[PDB]
């Protein structure tokens, strides 16, 4: 499977950056096709090794970034692995939200949450917790508006019913800020006026302080806010205008939010 000459056979690389994973990621040329792709280069490790068995195993299930191909190389002096994926040149989630001036709806955060569910669910049901849903990780394929969204970086990646709750907890941070424009660490007004009873309903159930009581995929999906998001109301949400307003402190919220994962993680917690 892996690939055991140089990647630069295949491939013509950028110094380029298009991401920074817990290694860091490359634009690259595919040589005999033109095709622009990204490189990620991670040193070899158990670690890196797990990574790229999980990803390999997700790769081709519904909104995960496909790996196009793993090369096994020495650079530096050093053995590493890089993954060439498809180049998700959307970019950011919540960066493309901003952008928009243009109604953002309920009904369409409902679709973005189920695309976000429906990765969650395959990966669950072939028993693999991602443990670092957050903003830096959920990405388009273009800049159009036909771009799909993906799920990638299987670099914590487990293969626990507690692991999967961890996921859980991610999808009620992500659908609350997609909401409102801002994250859970109530729902204040105005900015949730006239949201949905039954948005409100499973963010509760998904930020359970107790993992045990949070809801599955299972029920996330059956939700009726997910299962039936293309009949949930369009109304025009504050979320653009809030991360517009409030990117100066875009930053922080993403260091709190990777922060919170990285505490679910550690074998032993305080109380
Ligand atoms: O594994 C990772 N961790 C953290 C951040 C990260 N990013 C990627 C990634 C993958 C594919 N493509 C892109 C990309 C391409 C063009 C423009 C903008 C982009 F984000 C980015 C992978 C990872």
Not at 54 to 73: F, M, R, T
Not at 195 to 217: F, N
């Amino acid at each position: 499977e892996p690939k055991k000459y140089a990647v630069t056979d295949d491939y013509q690389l950028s110094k380029q950056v298009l991401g920074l994973g817990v290694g860091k990621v490359l634009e690259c040329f595919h040589r005999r096709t033109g095709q622009k792709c990204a490189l990620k280069l991670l040193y070899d490790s158990p670690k890196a090794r797990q990574e790229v068995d999980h990803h390999w195993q997700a790769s081709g299930g519904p909104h995960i970034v496909c790996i196009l191909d793993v090369y096994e190389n020495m650079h530096h002096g050093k053995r590493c692995l890089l993954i060439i994926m498809e180049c998700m040149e959307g970019g950011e989630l919540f960066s493309r939200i901003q952008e928009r001036d243009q109604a953002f709806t309920e009904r369409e955060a409902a679709e973005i949450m189920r695309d976000i569910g429906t990765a969650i669910q395959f990966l669950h049901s072939h028993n693999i917790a991602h443990r670092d849903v957050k903003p830096e990780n959920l990405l388009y394929t273009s800049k159009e508006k036909d771009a799909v969204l993906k799920l990638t970086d299987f670099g914590f990646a487990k293969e626990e019913k507690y692991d999967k709750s961890c996921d859980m907890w991610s999808l009620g941070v992500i659908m609350y800020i997609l909401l409102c424009g801002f994250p859970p660490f109530g729902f204040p007004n105005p900015e949730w006026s006239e949201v949905s009873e039954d948005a409100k309903q499973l963010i509760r159930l998904l930020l359970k302080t107790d993992p045990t009581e949070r809801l599955t995929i299972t029920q996330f999906m059956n939700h009726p806010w997910i299962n039936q998001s293309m009949v949930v109301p369009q109304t025009p949400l504050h979320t653009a205008r809030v991360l517009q307003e409030d990117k100066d402190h875009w930053d922080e919220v993403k260091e709190e939010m990777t922060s919170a994962l990285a505490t679910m993680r550690v074998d032993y917690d305080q109380v």
